[PDB]
């Protein structure tokens, strides 16, 4: 009938009607959460006829990897899995297979710039997990390991796969560590405005609202199918960096800081027909994530106004390019503060250059590299970056990290 279009800044929604008068030649590239990138719920297992080929394909992928293939084991695994599939329905992956799966899924993530590190990933096997509290422990082990007291390490903790579709392990948080956002009495908004709805959710499940600008939200976990059990993260585990500029001593007066761990929580790992709706992973920050998006987005902390004022710029004259000046200084603050406190981070330039190197390796190696330009190009200094001038094809392979429907919309309340 029509296509929905949302503005993530003002949150406004529009309905596109014109597209119908298009030519006999409509890219959805600009869309954030397209259905083609999401993998929703279920009620029944994966039909054998689908599951089987996917499984075989995957096993062919894996065994087709290593130099000098283990043909016998290849055939054996193929045979063993086929058997296991007909006997149980679903099937279990050899640890070394998961490792390969997680790395390939990352390698296949078109919206990630850090993919040159695809082979350096730590996998935590939590497939035998069965309770929320047990998830919580694995997560803490994850956060602890990843943080490594500043020297951030990329890792992913894979929880139990999907069985029937009503026994899903799910983290309700956007990311492992994330600040809270409260709509205060005086009409304002404190904290991360992006985590507004979710915070209310935590509140609704009896969470204690600490009402600040940097209150780390609680881990909302759900095991098997059972309702979400709220767990607060041990503050000793949450490492942070206090923001301070190398020249503007007044910058620390802003009382700004941010967590050192960028760990995605709510994504789904698809591999060989199987799907793990819970498998938080982490890399390390890229300056612009915090400096540009987190701190300067209208929908987030929105600090541009005053960083500009405090810099003495003509904040009431767009043409003065003060926003360009401020943001840059915020970016250095972040980079400086992370560097100073020995917490891993990479600026957007060195990051882009390494990605360009990644593609070169990728194309020469497997002949391609799924890339989402819109996501790969840094939120600032676009063309100054190599990736801006690089043409790319955005396509979904397998294994893959799909988005998924926010669990609180599709959940049972017993």
Ligand X SMILES: C[C@H](O)[C@H](O)[C@H]1CNc2nc(N)[nH]c(=O)c2N1
Interface residue with ligand HEM among 108, 154, 161, 173 (CB under 6 A) is 154
Using CB distances below 5 to 8 A depending on partner kind, what does residue 69 bind out of ligand HEM, ligand X, its own copies, none? none
Alpha-carbon distance of 28 to 13, in angstroms, equals 16
Which positions from 375 through 414 interact with ligand X, judged by CB under 6 A?
375, 388-391
Would the annotation count 285 as a binding residue?
A: yes
Q: Does 111 bind ligand HEM (CB under 6 A)?
A: yes
Residue nearest to ligand HEM (CB): 283
Q: Is omega for the bond preceding 171 within 30 degrees of 0, making it cis?
A: no
User: Has 141 been annotated as catalytic?
Assistant: no
Q: List Cα–Cα distances, 309 to 190, 306, 329, in angstroms.
A: 20, 5, 13
In this structure, are residues 112 and 351 in contact, taking their beta carbons and an 8 Å threshold?
A: no
Instruction: Name the nearest CA neighbour of 114 among 125, 103, 124.
Output: 103
3-class DSSP assignment, residue 399: coil
Would the annotation count 190 as a binding residue?
A: no
Q: How many CB atoms lie within 10 A of CB 303?
A: 20
Would the annotation count 406 as a binding residue?
A: no
Nearest approach, Cβ of residue 73 and ligand HEM (Å)? 26
Instruction: Name the nearest CA neighbour of 160 among 203, 188, 125.
Output: 125
Order of strands, sheet of 219-222, starting from the edge strand that comes earlier in the sequence: 170-171, 219-222, 229-231
Residue nearest to ligand X (CB): 375
User: How many residues does the structure list for the chain?
Assistant: 414
Would the annotation count 388 as a binding residue?
A: yes
Instruction: Name the nearest CA neighbour of 258 among 203, 214, 206.
Output: 214
Q: How many CB atoms lie within 10 A of CB 255?
A: 9
Which positions from 265 through 304 interact with ligand X, judged by CB under 6 A?
none
User: Has 129 been annotated as catalytic?
Assistant: no
CA atoms within 13 A on the CB side of 235: 2
Would the annotation count 310 as a binding residue?
A: no
**Nearer to its own copies by C-beta: 215 or 329?**
329
Interface residue with ligand X among 2, 5, 8, 357 (CB under 6 A) is 8
For residue 296 the two structure tokens come to 């300067």
x/- mask, ligand HEM, residues 252-291, rule CB under 6 A, reads ------------x----------------x-xx-x--x--
**Nearer to ligand HEM by C-beta: 81 or 346?**
346
User: Has 12 been annotated as catalytic?
Assistant: no
Would the annotation count 289 as a binding residue?
A: yes
Helix (H) or strand (E) holding 269: strand 268-271
Interface residue with ligand X among 374, 386, 398, 405 (CB under 6 A) is 374
> Phi, psi at residue 400, to the nearest 5°?
-160, 155
Alpha-carbon distance of 362 to 112, in angstroms, equals 14
Would the annotation count 375 as a binding residue?
A: yes
**Nearer to ligand X by C-beta: 32 or 393?**
32
Nearest approach, Cβ of residue 266 and ligand HEM (Å)? 9
Q: Is the dihedral of CA 12, 175, 157, 132 positive or negative?
A: negative
Q: Does 114 bind ligand HEM (CB under 6 A)?
A: yes
Residue of 77, 97, 112, 162 with catalytic role: 112
Residue 307: partners with Cβ closer than 8 Å, 6 or more residues away = 251, 254, 326, 329, 330
User: Has 322 been annotated as catalytic?
Assistant: no
Residues belonging to the binding site for heme b are 112, 403
Interface residues toward ligand HEM, by CB under 6 A = 106, 109, 111-114, 117, 121, 154, 156, 264, 281, 283-284, 286, 289, 346, 351, 401
Residues belonging to the binding site are 27, 30, 112, 175, 284-285, 289, 293, 374-375, 388, 403
Active site residues: 112, 115, 284, 289
Interface residues toward ligand X, by CB under 6 A = 8, 30, 32, 374-375, 388-391
């Amino acid at each position: 009938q029509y296509v929905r279009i949302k503005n993530w800044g003002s949150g406004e929604i529009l309905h596109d009607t014109l597209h119908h008068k298009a030519t006999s030649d409509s890219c959805l590239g600009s869309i954030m959460n397209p259905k083609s990138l999401t993998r929703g719920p279920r009620d029944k297992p994966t039909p054998l006829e689908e599951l089987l080929p996917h499984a075989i394909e995957f096993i062919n992928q894996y065994y087709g990897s290593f130099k000098e293939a283990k043909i016998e084991e290849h055939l054996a695994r193929l045979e063993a899995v086929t058997k296991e599939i007909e006997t149980t329905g679903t099937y279990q992956l050899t640890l070394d297979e998961l490792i390969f799966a997680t790395k390939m899924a990352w390698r296949n993530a078109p919206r990630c710039i850090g993919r040159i590190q695809w082979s350096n990933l730590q996998v935590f096997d939590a497939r035998n997990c069965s309770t929320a509290q047990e998830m919580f422990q694995h997560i803490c082990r994850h956060i602890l390991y990843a943080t490594n007291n500043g020297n951030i390490r990329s890792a992913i903790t894979v929880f139990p796969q999907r069985s029937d579709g009503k026994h899903d392990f799910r983290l309700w948080n956007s990311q492992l560590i994330r600040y809270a956002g409260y709509q205060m009495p005086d009409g304002t908004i404190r904290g991360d405005a992006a985590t507004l709805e979710f915070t209310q959710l935590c509140i609704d499940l009896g969470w204690k609202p600490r009402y600040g600008r940097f209150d780390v939200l609680p881990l909302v976990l759900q095991a098997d199918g059972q309702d979400p059990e709220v767990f607060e993260i041990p503050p000793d585990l949450v490492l942070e960096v206090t923001m301070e500029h190398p020249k503007y001593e007044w910058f620390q007066e802003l009382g700004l800081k941010w967590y050192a761990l960028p760990a995605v929580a709510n994504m789904l790992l698809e591999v060989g027909g199987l799907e793990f709706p819970a498998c938080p992973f982490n890399g390390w920050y890229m300056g612009t994530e915090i400096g540009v998006r987190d701190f300067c987005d209208t929908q987030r902390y929105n600090i541009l106004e005053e960083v500009g004022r405090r810099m003495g710029l003509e904040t009431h004259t767009l043409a003065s390019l003060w926003k360009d000046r401020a943001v840059t200084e915020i970016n250095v603050a972040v980079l400086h503060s992370f560097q100073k406190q020995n917490v891993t981070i990479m600026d957007h330039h060195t990051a882009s250059e390494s990605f360009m190197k990644h593609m070169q390796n990728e194309y020469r190696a497997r002949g391609g590299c799924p890339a989402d330009w819109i996501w790969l190009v840094p939120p600032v200094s676009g063309s100054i970056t190599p990736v801006f001038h690089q043409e790319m094809l955005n396509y979904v392979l397998s294994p893959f990290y799909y988005y998924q429907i926010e669990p609180w919309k599709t959940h049972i309340w017993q």
